[PDB]
Amino acid sequence: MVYPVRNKDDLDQQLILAEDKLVVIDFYADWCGPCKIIAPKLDELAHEYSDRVVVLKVNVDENEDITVEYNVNSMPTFVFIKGGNVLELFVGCNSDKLAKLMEKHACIVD
Amino acid sequence: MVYPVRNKDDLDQQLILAEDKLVVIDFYADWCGPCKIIAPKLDELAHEYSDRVVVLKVNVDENEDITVEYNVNSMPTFVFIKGGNVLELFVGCNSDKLAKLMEKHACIVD
Ligand SMILES: [Zn+2]
Ligand SMILES: [Zn+2]
Ligand SMILES: [Zn+2]
Ligand SMILES: [Zn+2]
């Protein structure tokens, strides 16, 4: 399952506890159609990769600070992180690419 | 000669332009003794096989994304690729094996 981020200090802690794991952060809002469509597949991947991947979820309406720090301008946006380093940024609704990007490292509103 | 990779999109383009050729990617860093020793022999082979083999070079300190995607954990590491497929992975400093592996398909830091 996908862990909601309450604030920047929550997220900063999660990034350190993730250790060597792949971290994937999903920026979403409740008013975003494409966000809702891809969300089941993201939860499916989180179970398949639970030993290797940590999956975080940032609600942009309550987290303006985290959104500005990651330069999020569109939704959905998935940031792939390992060791506090941003490896790759991915915007859009292709859930087949999302699943592929998750295995290699283990439509658009606003 | 050996072509430096600037990013993942650079590398992805190189993999397609290489066509049917053998591609060899060398993962290295400036702080890696064994990397520096084998490097002349790699350049020698690149000239001998210039019509058949494309030789790419990825600096791991500036390319965390490519390193994670190829699961690089040590140096030097040579990935042998043909058609976007990874045929073989080779870690270590034996330049005689490197030359042999190059002809069949045409010490350790971190
Ligand atoms: Zn569950
Ligand atoms: Zn030359
Ligand atoms: Zn990547
Ligand atoms: Zn082979």
Author numbering:
A (entry chain A), B (entry chain A): 1 to 106, 125 to 128
Show me the paper's own sentences about this structure.
Thioredoxins (Trxs) are ubiquitous enzymes that regulate the redox state in cells. In Drosophila, there are two germline-specific Trxs, Deadhead (Dhd) and thioredoxin T (TrxT), that belong to the lethal(3)malignant brain tumor signature genes and to the ‘survival network’ of genes that mediate the cellular response to DNA damage. Trxs share a conserved catalytic motif, with two conserved cysteine residues embedded in a canonical fold consisting of five β-strands and four α-helices. Drosophila Dhd, TrxT and Trx-2 are intermediate between these two characteristic folds, displaying four α-helices (as in all Trx structures) but only four β-strands (β2–β5).
TrxT is testis-specific and associates with the lampbrush loops of the Y chromosome. The second difference is related to the TrxT fold, which is composed of a highly conserved core and a variable C-terminal domain, with the latter being absent in most canonical Trxs. This extra domain is mostly unstructured, with a high ratio of negatively charged residues. In D. melanogaster, this C-terminal domain is attached to the protein core via a covalent link that stabilizes a closed conformation that partially covers the catalytic site. The regions connecting Gly107 to Asp111 and His120 to Cys125 were also traceable, but unfortunately the fragment connecting Asp111 to His120 and the last 26 amino acids were not visible in the density, which is also in agreement with the rapid motions and negative 15N–[1H] NOE values measured for these residues. Moreover, in the case of TrxT the crystals contain two TrxT molecules engaged with a symmetry-related neighbor stabilized through the coordination of a Zn atom (which was present in the crystallization condition). The zinc is bound between Asp65 and Glu69 from monomer A and His105 and Glu88 from monomer B [Supplementary Fig. S3(b)]. Overall, these results underline the hypothesis that the C-terminal domain shields the active site of TrxT and modulates its redox activity.
